[PDB]
Write an enzyme that holds these catalytic residues in place. Structure first.
Site, PDB file in Angstrom:
ATOM      1  N   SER A   1      51.863 -17.806  -0.890  1.00  0.00           N
ATOM      2  CA  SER A   1      50.893 -18.270   0.099  1.00  0.00           C
ATOM      3  C   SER A   1      50.086 -19.407  -0.511  1.00  0.00           C
ATOM      4  O   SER A   1      49.185 -19.198  -1.323  1.00  0.00           O
ATOM      5  CB  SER A   1      49.992 -17.128   0.549  1.00  0.00           C
ATOM      6  OG  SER A   1      50.734 -16.132   1.229  1.00  0.00           O
ATOM      7  N   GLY A   2      50.419 -20.632  -0.116  1.00  0.00           N
ATOM      8  CA  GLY A   2      49.661 -21.787  -0.548  1.00  0.00           C
ATOM      9  C   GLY A   2      50.509 -22.886  -1.148  1.00  0.00           C
ATOM     10  O   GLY A   2      49.983 -23.934  -1.532  1.00  0.00           O
TER      11      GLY A   2
ATOM     12  N   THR B   1      53.825 -24.451   5.228  1.00  0.00           N
ATOM     13  CA  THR B   1      53.533 -25.014   6.540  1.00  0.00           C
ATOM     14  C   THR B   1      53.520 -26.535   6.513  1.00  0.00           C
ATOM     15  O   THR B   1      53.934 -27.169   7.490  1.00  0.00           O
ATOM     16  CB  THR B   1      52.193 -24.487   7.057  1.00  0.00           C
ATOM     17  OG1 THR B   1      52.117 -23.073   6.837  1.00  0.00           O
ATOM     18  CG2 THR B   1      52.048 -24.767   8.543  1.00  0.00           C
TER      19      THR B   1
ATOM     20  N   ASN C   1      45.352 -15.788  -1.673  1.00  0.00           N
ATOM     21  CA  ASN C   1      45.078 -16.997  -0.907  1.00  0.00           C
ATOM     22  C   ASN C   1      44.127 -16.649   0.228  1.00  0.00           C
ATOM     23  O   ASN C   1      44.032 -15.497   0.656  1.00  0.00           O
ATOM     24  CB  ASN C   1      46.370 -17.621  -0.370  1.00  0.00           C
ATOM     25  CG  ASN C   1      46.182 -19.057   0.076  1.00  0.00           C
ATOM     26  OD1 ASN C   1      45.368 -19.791  -0.482  1.00  0.00           O
ATOM     27  ND2 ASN C   1      46.935 -19.465   1.092  1.00  0.00           N
TER      28      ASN C   1
ATOM     29  N   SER D   1      46.831 -16.845   4.461  1.00  0.00           N
ATOM     30  CA  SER D   1      48.140 -16.273   4.180  1.00  0.00           C
ATOM     31  C   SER D   1      48.836 -15.918   5.485  1.00  0.00           C
ATOM     32  O   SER D   1      48.268 -15.215   6.324  1.00  0.00           O
ATOM     33  CB  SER D   1      48.015 -15.033   3.295  1.00  0.00           C
ATOM     34  OG  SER D   1      49.248 -14.726   2.673  1.00  0.00           O
ATOM     35  N   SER D   2      50.065 -16.399   5.646  1.00  0.00           N
ATOM     36  CA  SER D   2      50.842 -16.118   6.844  1.00  0.00           C
ATOM     37  C   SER D   2      51.382 -14.695   6.791  1.00  0.00           C
ATOM     38  O   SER D   2      52.057 -14.312   5.831  1.00  0.00           O
ATOM     39  CB  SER D   2      51.986 -17.120   6.986  1.00  0.00           C
ATOM     40  OG  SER D   2      52.895 -17.010   5.906  1.00  0.00           O
TER      41      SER D   2
ATOM     42  N   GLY E   1      57.371 -14.657   0.903  1.00  0.00           N
ATOM     43  CA  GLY E   1      58.204 -14.498  -0.268  1.00  0.00           C
ATOM     44  C   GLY E   1      57.929 -13.179  -0.962  1.00  0.00           C
ATOM     45  O   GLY E   1      57.050 -12.412  -0.564  1.00  0.00           O
TER      46      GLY E   1
ATOM     47  N   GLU F   1      56.540 -10.492  -3.338  1.00  0.00           N
ATOM     48  CA  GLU F   1      55.209 -10.305  -3.896  1.00  0.00           C
ATOM     49  C   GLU F   1      55.151  -9.015  -4.699  1.00  0.00           C
ATOM     50  O   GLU F   1      55.615  -7.965  -4.245  1.00  0.00           O
ATOM     51  CB  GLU F   1      54.138 -10.291  -2.798  1.00  0.00           C
ATOM     52  CG  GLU F   1      54.435  -9.368  -1.634  1.00  0.00           C
ATOM     53  CD  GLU F   1      53.522  -9.625  -0.453  1.00  0.00           C
ATOM     54  OE1 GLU F   1      53.362 -10.803  -0.070  1.00  0.00           O
ATOM     55  OE2 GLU F   1      52.961  -8.653   0.092  1.00  0.00           O
TER      56      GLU F   1
HETATM   57  N1  LIG Z   1      53.253 -32.347   0.502  1.00  0.00           N
HETATM   58  C1  LIG Z   1      51.918 -32.130   0.473  1.00  0.00           C
HETATM   59  N2  LIG Z   1      51.048 -33.155   0.345  1.00  0.00           N
HETATM   60  C2  LIG Z   1      49.720 -32.955   0.316  1.00  0.00           C
HETATM   61  N3  LIG Z   1      49.144 -31.744   0.409  1.00  0.00           N
HETATM   62  C3  LIG Z   1      49.896 -30.627   0.540  1.00  0.00           C
HETATM   63  C4  LIG Z   1      51.359 -30.763   0.581  1.00  0.00           C
HETATM   64  N4  LIG Z   1      51.856 -29.521   0.716  1.00  0.00           N
HETATM   65  C5  LIG Z   1      50.804 -28.667   0.758  1.00  0.00           C
HETATM   66  N5  LIG Z   1      49.637 -29.325   0.654  1.00  0.00           N
HETATM   67  C6  LIG Z   1      48.287 -28.708   0.663  1.00  0.00           C
HETATM   68  O1  LIG Z   1      48.378 -27.306   0.406  1.00  0.00           O
HETATM   69  C7  LIG Z   1      47.467 -26.591   1.240  1.00  0.00           C
HETATM   70  C8  LIG Z   1      48.084 -25.286   1.714  1.00  0.00           C
HETATM   71  O2  LIG Z   1      49.367 -25.549   2.274  1.00  0.00           O
HETATM   72  P1  LIG Z   1      49.986 -24.566   3.384  1.00  0.00           P
HETATM   73  O3  LIG Z   1      51.351 -25.081   3.757  1.00  0.00           O
HETATM   74  O4  LIG Z   1      48.958 -24.314   4.457  1.00  0.00           O
HETATM   75  O5  LIG Z   1      50.145 -23.203   2.546  1.00  0.00           O
HETATM   76  P2  LIG Z   1      51.193 -22.061   2.965  1.00  0.00           P
HETATM   77  O6  LIG Z   1      52.459 -22.486   2.274  1.00  0.00           O
HETATM   78  O7  LIG Z   1      50.589 -20.789   2.424  1.00  0.00           O
HETATM   79  O8  LIG Z   1      51.245 -22.132   4.470  1.00  0.00           O
HETATM   80  C9  LIG Z   1      47.151 -27.491   2.420  1.00  0.00           C
HETATM   81  O9  LIG Z   1      45.738 -27.542   2.633  1.00  0.00           O
HETATM   82  C10 LIG Z   1      47.674 -28.861   2.046  1.00  0.00           C
HETATM   83  O10 LIG Z   1      46.595 -29.796   2.004  1.00  0.00           O
HETATM   84 MG   LIG Z   2      50.929 -21.293   6.497  1.00  0.00          MG
END
Ligand SMILES: Nc1ncnc2c1ncn2[C@@H]1O[C@H](COP(=O)(O)OP(=O)(O)O)[C@@H](O)[C@H]1O
Ligand SMILES: [Mg+2]
Ligand SMILES: Nc1ncnc2c1ncn2[C@@H]1O[C@H](COP(=O)(O)OP(=O)(O)O)[C@@H](O)[C@H]1O
Ligand SMILES: Nc1ncnc2c1ncn2[C@@H]1O[C@H](COP(=O)(O)OP(=O)(O)O)[C@@H](O)[C@H]1O
Ligand SMILES: Nc1ncnc2c1ncn2[C@@H]1O[C@H](COP(=O)(O)OP(=O)(O)O)[C@@H](O)[C@H]1O
Ligand SMILES: [Mg+2]
Ligand SMILES: [Mg+2]
Ligand SMILES: [Mg+2]
Lengths: 371, 681, 371, 370
Positions: free
Chosen positions: B157-158, B162, B204, B207-208, B437, B439
């Site tokens: 998560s993080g 997304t 995190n 977390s999804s 994933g 955990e």
């Molecule tokens: N390719 C990227 N470029 C810039 N920032 C990123 C990138 N990938 C992730 N982040 C940062 O990581 C943080 C969390 O990503 P997110 O995808 O929401 O987490 P998760 O994988 O848990 O969903 C976001 O606030 C984003 O700003």
């Molecule tokens: Mg997410």
């Protein structure tokens, strides 16, 4: 003044005179009472039927045994049975005859005291004595050393005696006998459709057991042959004309003596009880205790009970010892036959309990005069 | 040896995730050399440490884009290659055809109209690794093969799971034509779904808690027609029980901190620590998130996706009724030698009935009694306190679970265009999966068991794909692969789900068995699986933990906690209370249930049963498409732009299942050469 | 697929699917045949009527029960009720669903074998099983320990269970239930001038019983109250418009469960049978069996039966135990509920009787696999 | 630190060396089901050990692995040892040396098989076997004194003077608490009370422990019992039945002084102690007269010491002073002394190590212990 020997057991009452060869008043120990309604005015109606007359009018009465597992529960039905035995069977007034009674080795101490009180007050016998059934069985068998396996319809006790000396610490009392043997056949007979519930039908189940039940030498090899053919099946006719058929309950019923777990008991079989009773004696007495196994009581009358017992004791005993099971053809009355011998002895006439001693001591004199 | 050679130094330490670290030999003098590792720390070797130092392959010193070409194919080789490329702002790396992505925590200018055009119509390996290159070959493959495709993004998560799905839409909308509303509409559903399906965990703050499937629909000539959002595996146990240092779904807190006092009066709502459901983990306020502007972000996104204000008010009433019912307190009674209950007086019961629009006496006699309907008569039966605290918690999760479907359908009513190809089915699609994933926390529970069980199916999907591709690499070279062993992780699956008397059914069986507890379930699990190599029984009779040997490793679950989460008892009286409600919204979300009013005699599925049904649906959706895999790695626990934690990254590499790819390569012919290589030797 | 549960009792057939809350089909276990002359040519002719269709067209049929006192006496007619249950009531093919059957404890052995053979040869079920009803009454009650009194329409049995272990020697089986009660009510309704004779009027008397019969806490005081006043009288309207009044007959009919001598039986009441079954178990089990009297069956639905049972067992037990009678409101379906719970278990799936095993062993595999 | 396992015939006293009281004290029984399991799904165990076997007492058959000090069923003994090590102490047997106790005169195979099993099944680093009557002096904080240890399997006397023991004066008796329990069972069938099963013997044991005392004068107490009901107590059975007993409260704790009741041709505890003291040197006897230690739970009968003093005063010379030392915690004296002994620095060189066992076989115990 001839002495009276009354071997009043749980199911059957054995009476007679001291000196005779066989009992003369062998009759059951039930006391029936009317159950249904009487409609015919003028008929002679009795409120209690005792003895053989309770088996003839067995369809309109509720039968009750006053003695269970050796202990006497109904002291009024016991008085009725004793009155019937003394008046209607022996035709002797109890005032002028000494009486002898038998009791289980490990019964409660109040039972013998109550018998003493009843015999010394209600019937006013001149003398009385209470003996142990195993000693009388040895007297009937004409031996001085041996262990008896007495089994009636109430208790199954073993008493080891050596040269006229008994070992109290090796006496075993197990409350498993004919009664549960009948109540278990009456329960396993429901697997083929027959349903006997009435106390009068229990007397038919007892007759079926006394006539078609034997002891198998090998239970597994007997079941393997009772489940492979129909050569072990036997028939029997009820007092209403219906014919039952039994295939394996014949040898499954009596085995609850060698395997008490059939009826939910944790105890050991009669063979193991006898072995443990012999192994609790001195090392020297065991040799002639092994070859003097005397079987008494009506429950030792099954065909084949004298061979399975010998086989089991031989398997439990060292291979250099001689195991002999002495089963007289008249062991159903050996207690009374030995009681008569004991009461006909000249050295025993000083062992009676007189009325003066009872009057000056109380009901507690039996604990010192007897055994 | 020489004063300029790279070496594989192994600082032996008591660490579970410790691997050799690369170092360069410098100041080679005297009997003791000096080395500086990849983390810029200085060490002394001493002549008594000669096995620690091992020469490093020239492939591992200069870095390689595709790791399967490494001379040193091991965990240390992978870790250093990622580390030396992250410092160069190269966050994308291949392992065969699997894209490893590392969270930059920084705006990297590699997502531009010049980068999307640079990556068009080019295969894997022709261009440096990128997130577009996964989408590039995914789009082109369905046009040449006439087959559905899918992308599986997974990680902790993080680690930008997304973000990697948002950026896989950036290329994909441009490669076809105009970005269209669908690109902007899909991005507006993210703040909505991240409120009803995300929560703060101990790792995190966002977390999804489910699996999002953005199914992108295409047409002939290759243009976007529509899209569908399919939700899978939702942790419905979180609605009523949260662990320490964890909170419930974001929506509750956001609504409470972002609703006017007047409205919060009509809903009988106040604060958020006054709710047992919300306050249980003692984490009402989370650092890094403010729940007041988050509410406005959801409301703005709802308006764009055509949520009328009437629909927003009815959703909040259902959420308020969820919080009020959680404040009800039950007291054990005895009717007549039978267990019974009595809901204690509280103003929440009056409000919950008003918000649910049912008669107060009809809600009181729906949580403390059960009606048995049979041919000719109906009988009412009291419920015990442990049974009373199972219908209240199942009615709360039934509203939330059926509400979450309603938002998903309402979003799909604006982005999904039915197949215009009514005449014939000529539409291909590209699916995207934002799945969780593996955990392994300090204390694991029922939810972690389900999450790890889901990854066992996903990791089997990965392995079977890696097996296949390496088989076709052998047959274009006419290399006969019949001496190589290809084993599948069916043993773990055949102990949890796919066998009689498995782990899950024994949890289900003990949930209904008379006088069943967590201690009795543990004995049941041991008595059946003690002679199994994948089951670790507790050492004593006082321990309350059992271990399952997953693909990542042995993980220990805590027995104390099961049989309470694994109970979803929706009685037939609950479906009859909703049908009699004046509220037309709660009847709309229960539309399927009220139709089969008399068919609810069948016992309601437990959460382990419902979880397995969704997993079967997901594995069937993925099995019909060619898979692409993206591995997401977070390099830091403090969200720093340029901090790479070695011990953190090694755990995620082991838990991702990617190390399996190396194992078969070693099992086969690991070193491959061309005829030009024969010049040497 | 989903397993079926068929609790085919003497009076009613409770059927459904495993994993449900209540039986889907609950219909009488009767087979009816016309006894008159059909004069109208063209009417639909049916030689037999099974279930509710025999109770509807009841004034022109003869009603017969294929099951009496737990034992199936008419197998050709019992084979019609199973067909009706499988095809008409449940609407399911029997060759695709495992079937769970129930039986009383002390029941003749051939009944279960014939049920197995019929299931495997006529209906071609893939698997089946036969379970004891009192064991399922504990599954439905959510207990692993307790003594269960299950009184249905043919039998009344007590089964003591402790921690999932049954003591088979303490299981008792009385043949007295709601059909003997119905016959006694038919007999004693002739004292007020109502004559109910036919098999179609016996079902009227059964409804009168179920709607107006209760159990008196003190029989001899309720009789005096009925003699003194008319506050106990209630009226019932016959299916033709005639009204009947009954007074002390409302509590005189259920009394025969506590005084079996009213119908001429010698056995003891259900209160004394329970105590005799408790006192036949181990001494360390009795305290946990006293407070766990679970009552099951439709005959235990009289008002006041639980109170009278508690009173009588409290009088029979030492004044230190906590006598508790557990009578759930849904105890008329507890056997079926427990059967469904058992059939939904994962551990039970290895204990079915598959058709391979039946084809290998025969109809005797049920004795080795069931209880 | 180290493990001290006082392993008697009736109870298991286990703990750690250096502690003051045992940690685990549970019955030394293994129960097995004897009825039919009908409810499918219930967790079924084939054996229960200790307080879990005595809780499900009705549906089980209880069996003692130790009779009269000798271990007869080694499989059940191994089960009990496993329960003690893993469930009660929660220790790893392969990380703690274990100290075991044994009666003075036992067959040598009983001691050899304990060593072989402790070294080949539990892999203890070291083990030792001590005499229960010597640890009692350690607990009493004495160096000179005759110890009368009486558990429920054996009753033995060991005279010790200034740390030296006289093996020729050691006397072992096979009359103890489990013989008292069976004599009480036999003589309770004189009032109508039948106790036959193994689960109805643990009830008779509790009746004995709660209601039996030692009469100062047996013949003056049998007369008082008949004279008045002032010596008569009730006891409620587990099913609510009240049973009342009279002179059997002091007739059961009489076979200790009159073993002829059970049928054994042997002297009482007082005569055995007198003979054990008189089989020593004439100068030592004065110190053993005044230091008669008593250990065990069969020494816990109310009045047992007073009668011991009365009986040994009538056999010893009138110029000697007889003092019976009965500590208030004599039920745990053996374990306390074992912990004291195992906590000594000098004793650390007397452990039987695994290396010596590998070198010499299980026979090393006969040359290292006693
Ligand atoms: N390719 C990227 N470029 C810039 N920032 C990123 C990138 N990938 C992730 N982040 C940062 O990581 C943080 C969390 O990503 P997110 O995808 O929401 O987490 P998760 O994988 O848990 O969903 C976001 O606030 C984003 O700003
Ligand atoms: Mg997410
Ligand atoms: N031939 C026989 N076979 C089997 N059992 C018998 C036979 N004869 C008598 N019995 C059994 O013996 C029992 C009574 O024997 P007996 O010793 O005379 O009774 P009691 O012990 O009362 O004197 C009866 O219950 C009966 O079942
Ligand atoms: N309300 C009631 N009061 C008294 N008796 C009832 C009631 N309902 C049913 N019964 C009796 O229950 C009997 C059948 O119950 P049930 O246990 O379902 O039968 P079975 O055990 O044969 O399946 C009928 O004979 C009927 O007389
Ligand atoms: N208060 C008491 N009074 C009399 N006897 C007791 C008492 N407490 C325990 N006992 C007896 O002590 C015996 C066991 O004592 P103990 O020596 O502690 O165990 P072990 O002999 O197994 O080492 C038991 O058989 C019990 O009958
Ligand atoms: Mg006799
Ligand atoms: Mg029934
Ligand atoms: Mg001891």
């Amino acid at each position: 003044t001839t002495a009276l020997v009354c071997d009043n057991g749980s199911g059957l009452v054995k009476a007679g005179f001291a000196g005779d060869d066989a009992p003369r008043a062998v009759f059951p120990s039930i006391v029936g009472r009317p159950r249904h309604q009487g409609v015919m005015v003028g008929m002679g109606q009795k409120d209690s039927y005792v003895g053989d007359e309770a088996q003839s009018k067995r369809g309109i009465l509720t039968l009750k045994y006053p003695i269970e597992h050796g202990i006497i529960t109904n002291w009024d039905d016991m008085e009725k049975i004793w009155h019937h035995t003394f008046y209607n069977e022996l035709r002797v007034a109890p005032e002028e005859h000494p009486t002898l009674l038998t009791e289980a080795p490990l019964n409660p101490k109040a039972n013998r005291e109550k018998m003493t009180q009843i015999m010394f007050e209600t019937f006013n016998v001149p003398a009385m004595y209470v003996a142990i059934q195993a000693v009388l069985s040895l007297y009937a068998s004409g031996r001085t050393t041996g262990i008896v396996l007495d089994s009636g319809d109430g208790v199954t006790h073993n008493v080891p005696i050596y040269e006229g000396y008994a070992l109290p610490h090796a006496i075993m009392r197990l409350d498993l006998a004919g009664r549960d043997l009948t109540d278990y056949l009456m329960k396993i007979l429901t697997e083929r459709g027959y349903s006997f519930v009435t106390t009068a039908e229990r007397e038919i189940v007892r007759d079926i057991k006394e006539k078609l039940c034997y002891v198998a030498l090998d239970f597994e090899n007997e079941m393997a042959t009772a489940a492979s053919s129909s050569s072990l099946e036997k028939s029997y006719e009820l007092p209403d004309g219906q014919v039952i058929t039994i295939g394996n309950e014949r040898f499954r019923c009596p085995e609850t003596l060698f395997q008490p777990s059939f009826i939910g008991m944790e105890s050991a079989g009669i063979h193991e009880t006898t072995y443990n009773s012999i192994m609790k004696c001195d090392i020297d007495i065991r040799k002639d205790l092994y070859a003097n196994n005397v079987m008494s009581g009506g429950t030792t009358m099954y065909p084949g009970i004298a061979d399975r017992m010998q086989k089991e004791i031989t398997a439990l005993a060292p291979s250099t010892m001689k195991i002999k099971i002495i089963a007289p053809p008249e062991r159903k009355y050996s207690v009374w036959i030995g009681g008569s011998i004991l009461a006909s002895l000249s050295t025993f006439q000083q062992m009676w309990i007189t009325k003066q001693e009872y009057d000056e001591a109380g009901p507690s004199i039996v604990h010192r005069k007897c055994f | 040896v020489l004063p300029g050679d790279y070496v594989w130094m192994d600082l032996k330490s008591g660490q579970e995730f410790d691997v050799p670290i690369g170092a360069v030999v410098k100041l080679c003098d005297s009997g003791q050399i000096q080395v500086v590792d990849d983390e810029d720390n200085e060490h002394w070797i001493s002549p008594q440490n000669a096995t620690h130092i091992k020469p490093m392959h020239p492939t591992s010193v200069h870095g390689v884009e595709d790791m399967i070409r490494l001379g040193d194919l091991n965990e240390a080789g992978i870790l250093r290659n990622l580390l030396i490329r992250y410092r160069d702002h190269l966050i994308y790396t291949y392992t065969g055809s699997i894209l490893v992505a590392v969270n930059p925590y920084q705006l990297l200018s590699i997502y531009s109209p010049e980068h999307i055009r640079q990556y068009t119509n080019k295969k894997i390996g022709e261009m440096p690794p990128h997130i577009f290159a996964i989408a590039d070959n995914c789009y082109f493959n369905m046009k040449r093969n006439n087959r559905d495709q899918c992308c599986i993004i997974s990680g902790e998560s993080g680690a930008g799971k997304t973000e990697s799905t948002k950026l896989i839409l950036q290329f994909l909308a441009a490669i076809s034509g105009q970005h269209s509303w669908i690109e902007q509409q899909v991005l507006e559903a993210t703040p909505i779904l991240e409120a009803f399906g995300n929560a703060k965990t101990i790792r995190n703050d966002n977390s999804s808690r489910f699996g999002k499937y953005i199914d992108i629909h295409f047409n002939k000539r290759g243009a976007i027609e529509g899209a569908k959002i399919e939700q899978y595996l939702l942790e419905k146990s979180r609605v009523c029980r949260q662990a320490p240092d964890e909170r419930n779904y974001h929506v509750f807190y956001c609504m409470l901190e972002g609703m006017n006092e007047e409205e919060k009066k009509k809903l009988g709502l106040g604060q958020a620590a006054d709710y047992n459901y919300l306050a249980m983990g003692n984490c009402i306020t989370c650092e890094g998130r403010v729940d007041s502007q988050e509410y406005a972000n959801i409301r703005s996104a709802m308006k764009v996706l055509m949520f009328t204000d009437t629909e927003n008010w009815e959703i909040s009433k259902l959420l308020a009724a969820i919080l009020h019912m959680g404040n009800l307190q039950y007291e054990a009674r005895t009717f007549e030698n039978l267990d019974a209950c009595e809901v204690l007086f509280s103003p929440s019961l009056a409000t919950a009935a008003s918000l649910l629009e049912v008669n107060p006496p009809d809600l009181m006699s729906c949580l403390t009694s059960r009606t048995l309907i049979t041919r000719g008569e109906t009988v009412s039966t009291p419920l015990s306190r442990e049974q009373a605290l199972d219908v209240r918690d199942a009615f709360v999760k039934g509203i939330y679970g059926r509400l979450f479907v309603w938002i998903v359908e309402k979003i799909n009513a604006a982005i999904y265009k039915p197949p215009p190809l009514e005449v014939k089915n000529s539409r291909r699609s590209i699916g995207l999966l934002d799945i969780f994933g593996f955990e392994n926390f300090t204390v694991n529970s029922f939810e972690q068991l389900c999450i790890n069980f889901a990854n066992e199916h996903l990791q089997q999907f990965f392995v079977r794909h890696v097996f296949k591709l390496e088989q076709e690499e052998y047959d274009l070279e006419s290399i006969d692969w019949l001496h190589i062993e290809f084993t599948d992780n069916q043993e773990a699956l055949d102990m949890i789900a796919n066998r009689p008397m498995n782990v899950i059914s024994l949890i289900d069986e003990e949930s209904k068995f008379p006088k069943g507890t967590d201690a009795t379930m543990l004995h049941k699990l041991n008595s059946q699986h003690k002679l199994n190599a994948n089951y670790v029984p507790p050492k004593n009779s006082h321990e309350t933990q059992f271990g399952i040997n997953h693909f990542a490793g042995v993980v220990y679950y805590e027995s104390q906690g099961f049989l309470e989460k694994n109970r979803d008892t929706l009685h037939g009286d609950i479906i009859q209370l909703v049908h009699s409600s004046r509220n037309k919204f709660i009847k709309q979300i229960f539309q399927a249930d009220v139709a089969m009013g008399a068919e609810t005699r069948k016992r309601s599925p437990t959460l382990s049963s419902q979880f397995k049904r969704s997993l079967e649906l997901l594995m069937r959706t993925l099995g019909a498409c060619q898979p692409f895999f993206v591995r997401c790695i977070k390099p830091n626990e403090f969200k720093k732009p340029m901090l790479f934690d070695r011990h953190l990254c090694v755990r995620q590499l082991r838990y991702s299942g990617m190390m399996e790819t190396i194992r078969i390569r070693h099992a086969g012919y690991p070193i491959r050469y061309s005829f030009v290589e024969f010049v040497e030797r």
